[PDB]
Design an enzyme around this catalytic site. Structure first.
Site, PDB file in Angstrom:
ATOM      1  N   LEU D  19       0.822  -1.207   0.000  1.00 50.39           N
ATOM      2  CA  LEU D  19       0.000   0.000   0.000  1.00 50.39           C
ATOM      3  C   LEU D  19       0.867   1.274   0.000  1.00 50.39           C
ATOM      4  CD1 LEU D  19      -2.818  -1.043   2.606  1.00 50.39           C
ATOM      5  CD2 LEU D  19      -2.656  -1.529   0.101  1.00 50.39           C
ATOM      6  N   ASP D  38      10.987   3.446   5.637  1.00 50.68           N
ATOM      7  CA  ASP D  38      10.754   2.016   5.742  1.00 50.68           C
ATOM      8  C   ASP D  38      12.056   1.342   6.187  1.00 50.68           C
ATOM      9  OD1 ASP D  38      10.047  -0.800   5.023  1.00 50.68           O
ATOM     10  OD2 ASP D  38       8.502   0.130   3.738  1.00 50.68           O
ATOM     11  N   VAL D  62       9.574   3.259  12.790  1.00 51.17           N
ATOM     12  CA  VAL D  62       8.509   4.187  13.219  1.00 51.17           C
ATOM     13  C   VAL D  62       8.434   4.407  14.730  1.00 51.17           C
ATOM     14  CG1 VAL D  62       7.116   3.896  11.148  1.00 51.17           C
ATOM     15  CG2 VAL D  62       6.742   2.370  13.142  1.00 51.17           C
ATOM     16  N   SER D 151      -7.833  -0.447   9.764  1.00 45.29           N
ATOM     17  CA  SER D 151      -8.281  -1.690   9.131  1.00 45.29           C
ATOM     18  C   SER D 151      -9.717  -1.823   9.562  1.00 45.29           C
ATOM     19  CB  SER D 151      -7.509  -2.929   9.654  1.00 45.29           C
ATOM     20  OG  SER D 151      -8.116  -4.174   9.234  1.00 45.29           O
ATOM     21  N   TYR D 164      -4.458  -7.212  16.777  1.00 46.25           N
ATOM     22  CA  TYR D 164      -4.568  -6.371  15.594  1.00 46.25           C
ATOM     23  C   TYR D 164      -5.839  -5.536  15.647  1.00 46.25           C
ATOM     24  CZ  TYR D 164      -4.318  -5.258  10.521  1.00 46.25           C
ATOM     25  OH  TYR D 164      -4.245  -4.612   9.305  1.00 46.25           O
ATOM     26  N   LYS D 168      -5.745  -1.461  15.758  1.00 42.42           N
ATOM     27  CA  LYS D 168      -6.367  -0.726  14.650  1.00 42.42           C
ATOM     28  C   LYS D 168      -7.587   0.076  15.113  1.00 42.42           C
ATOM     29  CE  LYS D 168      -3.496  -1.723  11.242  1.00 42.42           C
ATOM     30  NZ  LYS D 168      -2.869  -0.613  10.366  1.00 42.42           N
ATOM     31  N   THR D 199      -1.666  -7.185  -1.081  1.00 42.28           N
ATOM     32  CA  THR D 199      -0.337  -6.762  -0.667  1.00 42.28           C
ATOM     33  C   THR D 199       0.628  -7.941  -0.849  1.00 42.28           C
ATOM     34  OG1 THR D 199      -0.906  -7.373   1.572  1.00 42.28           O
ATOM     35  CG2 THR D 199      -1.242  -5.106   0.933  1.00 42.28           C
TER      36      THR D 199
HETATM   37 MG   LIG Z   1       4.735  -1.336   2.933  1.00 41.34          MG
END
Ligand SMILES: [Mg+2]
Ligand SMILES: [Mg+2]
Ligand SMILES: [Mg+2]
Ligand SMILES: [Mg+2]
Ligand SMILES: [Mg+2]
Ligand SMILES: [Mg+2]
Ligand SMILES: [Mg+2]
Ligand SMILES: [Mg+2]
Lengths: 253, 258, 254, 258
Positions: D19, D38, D62, D151, D164, D168, D199
């Site tokens: 994404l 990244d 991050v 998500s 998750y 999210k 993905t």
């Molecule tokens: Mg990525």
């Protein structure tokens, strides 16, 4: 002309002014044939005449089957009808009034008739026409954009009728998307906050603006039109309600 | 009898069967005078007779002002009307927006569904709220409370059920707006959104289809009972701080498209 | 004693005071053995001492596995552990994402808030749920039930309170996921999202708070919270649901 | 060059693949200087080199303040940093809250997920917002905009995926709070909640398993493309009135328990 819009046409209810007018101008500029479906005849014909060949005014009462069918026939002379934005717009009454009397039922049912029943009537007739079109290579035949309001989530004092009607449209969204999925017609909804509609067009503008985090102002018709165009063109957004409100959450008053 | 209910009465729309009957039985057992507001005359009269003199059947069409006003006058002979549970049930019209032969859904079928479930709810609410608003508040400021009935179809509407989904979403959205409206009267308004419930109408679909429904429900793995609904309704009537809220009562079910 | 609660016990995190204390008192009065799981030792012990031998205090840090496991052991001496209410309170770090002087919010403040309200909730839930899952189901198939505490800040978070909003929204989202996860064990999971409640901090400008609250025009009481928590533990069909308990309040930005 | 993007730059976390990569390519095509933030150094460098001098790779964790500050310095050499899309992710292992053997989920698995998706998002947001808050506003009052990625699991979390779902959901709830907090700075904050997207994780998924996903997705009956995500992000960065909103991008899918 953007690829999705090649050969195609659209209908915008409430298209003669306000949010609908901005939507008409955007869809027209992006290359669609557009029918301005509205009861405001002088304004609608003026807009259709201004825009020229690919814009047509049709006097349309959204709650009448025959009136909407005539708008559909008109759209199918401008191209293949594949898109619609239901943007027809337009006093407060508490459920128990200050003198103790109940809200008048007539006012409630008229609001439901215009905003909920009218939206369904346009949606079902336009969807039945779009369903007969040839799909594009990606399987999609077209898409609808309905208009609710954040009143459907955060209804205000004196606005129970509007809150109920617009909540109806909000809940309709996922159901209609599911229903129309076999025809490859996407259905999404814009829930605006406080928009600079014709009635609003600089003192009492600050009173509304005060509850709006950013931008601290009414939303423009062009911002609405941009949102509608995005919902028509993005291929994966479906069954979704998009709040378009500058992060406003309606207070009771 | 609990303090909230002393001297008070309630109206339950759809009170003659299913979810409404269980609500009537519960509220009556908790000490309220109850009006069974329904069009099912034989079932309703039978229930009123079974329960005795604090329970009355009134034949009520929820879309008729006259008829609801009569239910209100009856309730006010059983105590001071302070509560209503709007629980008239059944299915909406089953039709796709675009049907198999390419024709659109019948507009009549849609408007009938909106009329019964949304307009009918608003009509009961406006008239009952006006009566309750004229009552004296309790020491805590509260005059009464309403419970409306939506459905999780209002959040997760299914294929062929756009009419029901729209109507019930309308009820869901009405909840906070009505609570805000009625806050100066001290009348709370909340809504129950049931999942798949064990009522006669639901069970008319036959055992195979019911087995299918039970499979989508995480826990408990079954249809909800009318008594569970009645228990939620009673809670919304008695807890003093819950207001403008929609309570999902659904065994953690989320409706799939079909 | 209501049949749901016969022979059963419960843990209430934050049980020494406020919402948790009202919950302890209600569940105890309804016939459950109750563990007051809290770090406020004198207050918690005094509460257990007042209520008598069906109430025990256990000093519990909700983010420590060993600490929660000791609360569970205590609970299982008072009956079979079948319920928990995760009601540990307080506020998050009060700080803007971008502060007055141009500097970003302190990350430590955010992570502390997440640790206490979100990680702490999950830690209690996973350990209590493991214990409850080993209990015998009742005739209706249910082994037990959990009540989590979020806040309407999880839906309508406020200026300077992004950490608390994020933590509490995490709890909101956990609700349906945990109910689905625990459905095979017959353990229901629901959440209360309170509005502005009269917690001990509010015991000492109440009208400023009540002004955005439609009705009742006041702070919610601990007893109203406890009543909601009791309902979520006893109603057999409510599951995976978040209950707003807020007098119809919707939080404004400030 | 899109008018809003004149002289501006953007950071995309997770920008090396999936994404994030599509978002980098769209934003770069639209005239933004872009930082690919990244840990995937080889992919990230190759992408920055393919795109040319208006795209730079910066190895970014991050959750590290210094690492993210280095991405912001890089962004400010490409233009005025005004935008970020927070699209990082990671590999996850399913674990039920109570496992088959009776043991509880490992707390470490939960905290690692919260750290990456929630804490990581907040860390990027606070540091980027601080830099953007120092930029001169446009005439319309806007300094910039953030797009967070959640998500639909944050609304409809699944069995074995509680960590998750919670992380999210945290991002979802953060949206309106961060929009309010940043409103005085003219920095909009919106979020995309994707459904099932194509993905790199899905590249080797079997035809049967793709059919299983497709059967739950009303239309289009397929996984969402990275370009569709990118188009949504570009819209949220450009439309002047959308703020504090979560956009579901999911083909009308609602996640089932499994
Ligand atoms: Mg990525
Ligand atoms: Mg108009
Ligand atoms: Mg013309
Ligand atoms: Mg009935
Ligand atoms: Mg009788
Ligand atoms: Mg406490
Ligand atoms: Mg003791
Ligand atoms: Mg380069």
């Amino acid at each position: 002309t953007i690829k999705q819009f090649e050969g195609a046409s659209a209908i915008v209810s409430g298209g003669a002014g306000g949010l609908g007018e901005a939507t008409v101008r955007r869809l027209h500029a992006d290359g669609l044939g557009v029918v301005i479906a509205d009861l405001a005849a002088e304004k609608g014909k003026a807009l259709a005449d201004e825009l020229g060949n690919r814009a047509e005014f049709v006097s349309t009462n959204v709650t009448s089957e025959d009136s909407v069918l005539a708008a559909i026939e008109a759209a199918n002379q401008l191209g293949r009808l594949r898109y619609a934005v239901v943007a027809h717009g337009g006093v407060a009454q508490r459920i128990v009034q200050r003198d103790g009397s109940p809200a008048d039922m007539g006012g409630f049912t008229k609001t439901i008739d215009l905003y909920l029943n009218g939206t369904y009537n346009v949606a079902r007739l336009v969807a039945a026409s779009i369903a007969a079109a040839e799909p594009r290579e990606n399987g999609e035949r077209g898409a609808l954009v309905l208009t609710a309001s954040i009143a459907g989530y955060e209804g205000q004092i004196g606005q129970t009728a509007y809150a109920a009607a617009k909540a109806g449209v909000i809940g309709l969204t996922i159901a209609a998307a599911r229903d129309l999925s076999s025809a490859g017609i996407r259905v999404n909804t814009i829930a605006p906050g406080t928009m600079k509609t014709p009635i609003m067009e600089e003192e009492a503008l600050a009173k509304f603006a005060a509850n709006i985090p950013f931008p601290k102002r009414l939303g423009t018709p062009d911002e609405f039109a941009d949102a509608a165009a995005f919902l028509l063109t993005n291929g994966y957004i479906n069954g979704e309600v998009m709040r378009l409100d500058g992060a406003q959450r309606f207070t009771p008053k």
